[PDB]
Amino acid sequence: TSTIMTDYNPNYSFAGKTSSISDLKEVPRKNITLIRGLGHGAFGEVYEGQVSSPLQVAVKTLPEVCSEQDELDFLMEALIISKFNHQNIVRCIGVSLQSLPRFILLELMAGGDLKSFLRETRPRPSQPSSLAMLDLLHVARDIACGCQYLEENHFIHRDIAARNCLLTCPGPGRVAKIGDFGMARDIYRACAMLPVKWMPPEAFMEGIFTSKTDTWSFGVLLWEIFSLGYMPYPSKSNQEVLEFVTSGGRMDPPKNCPGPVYRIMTQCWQHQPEDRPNFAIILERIEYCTQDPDVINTALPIEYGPLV
Numbered sequence: 267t268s269t270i271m272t273d274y275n276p277n278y279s280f281a282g283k284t285s286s287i288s289d290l291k292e293v294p295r296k297n298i299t300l301i302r303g304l305g306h307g308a309f310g311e312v313y314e315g316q317v318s319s320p321l322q323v324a325v326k327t328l329p330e331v332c333s334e335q336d337e338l339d340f341l342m343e344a345l346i347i348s349k350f351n352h353q354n355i356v357r358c359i360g361v362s363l364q365s366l367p368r369f370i371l372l373e374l375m376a377g378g379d380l381k382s383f384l385r386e387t388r389p390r391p392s393q394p395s396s397l398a399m400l401d402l403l404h405v406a407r408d409i410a411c412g413c414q415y416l417e418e419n420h421f422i423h424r425d426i427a428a429r430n431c432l433l434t435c436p437g438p439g440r441v442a443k444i445g446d447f448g449m450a451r452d453i454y455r456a457c458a459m460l461p462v463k464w465m466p467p468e469a470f471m472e473g474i475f476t477s478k479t480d481t482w483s484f485g486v487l488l489w490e491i492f493s494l495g496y497m498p499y500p501s502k503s504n505q506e507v508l509e510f511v512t513s514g515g516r517m518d519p520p521k522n523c524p525g526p527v528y529r530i531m532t533q534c535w536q537h538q539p540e541d542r543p544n545f546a547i548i549l550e551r552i553e554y555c556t557q558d559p560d561v562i563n564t565a566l567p568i569e570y571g572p573l574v
């Protein structure tokens with residue numbers, strides 16, 4: 267049992283209901299086995315694990331060497347993810363906070379993060395039809411569905427970006443889900459690290475956030491998706507992007523991007539928040555793109571390399 271989690275005992279409210287550490291589902295430590303590291307994420311290394319044939323999970327761990335504020339951050343992360351209920355948001359199996367190091371147990375996303383996926387699964391001479399337009403539109407729909415759920419529930423994400431989206435598996439039938447809430451977590455509990463390149467004009471100027479903030483960011487996510495994992499605003503630094511965007515500058519279409527898809531991006535990037543579509547409208551426009559043969563029959567560019 268943690269001293270400062272129990273000393274502070276923060277409440278978390280979502281959708282008009284309040285929760286605390288006692289609502290989290292504590293899984294006995296003896297039921298949890300770590301299998302392998304999966305890379306660096308929230309709070310450091312994320313691990314593949316199994317609970318109690320067993321349940322496969324991703325495990326975030328809290329470093330035993332950490333501040334009181336890191337502890338509170340970890341608790342709040344558990345509270346936030348445990349209260350969401352949507353198929354396009356990673357599930358929380360539970361927590362193990364009463365042994366050290368402390369764990370949060372999450373849905374295992376075998377496909378990894380979307381940015382790395384797009385970069386590694388780009389069409390190439392060795393894998394010429396590794397992805398098609400419809401694969402990209404399905405990822406877009408999946409994430410817009412998760413964002414619509416957050417909007418409906420008045421939760422502002424603030425960091426919708428390909429790096430924070432995960433895939434259930436690499437192969438066909440993959441489902442994309444929002445897999446990080448670290449920015450929202452920090453804001454709930456209270457610059458060279460802000461995600462400037464995903465932020466609308468009114469964000470870094472006035473510090474005003476609404477769900478139309480997430481709409482802007484979703485537009486940038488769409489560019490990330492249809493570019494196959496390029497960094498937004500190629501060649502521009504954070505301050506160059508800030509000045510560019512606040513003066514009306516917008517990204518060009520990604521290579522081979524169909525016009526109807528690019529038009530969704532440019533609507534998401536309307537200077538005035540009121541002119542930006544909500545996620546219901548974004549979903550309708552993604553569906554229309556998905557039904558249009560000229561969109562879905564467009565070939566993605568082949569990135570040059572060897573046959574092996």
Ligand SMILES: CC(C)NC(=O)[C@H]1CC[C@@H](n2/c(=N/C(=O)c3ccc(F)cc3)[nH]c3ccc(CN4CCC(C(C)(C)O)CC4)cc32)CC1
Nearest residue numbers: 305306307312324372374375376377378379430436445446
């Ligand atoms: C900020 C957060 C979204 N990112 C992370 O936590 C990172 C660290 C874990 C990492 N990850 C990972 N994370 C999670 O499952 C996870 C992370 C956070 C959660 F809240 C929930 C689940 N699962 C992973 C499974 C595999 C792999 C390895 N990858 C599989 C696909 C493969 C291909 C097909 C592209 O060639 C390349 C190698 C990585 C996995 C995702 C990125």
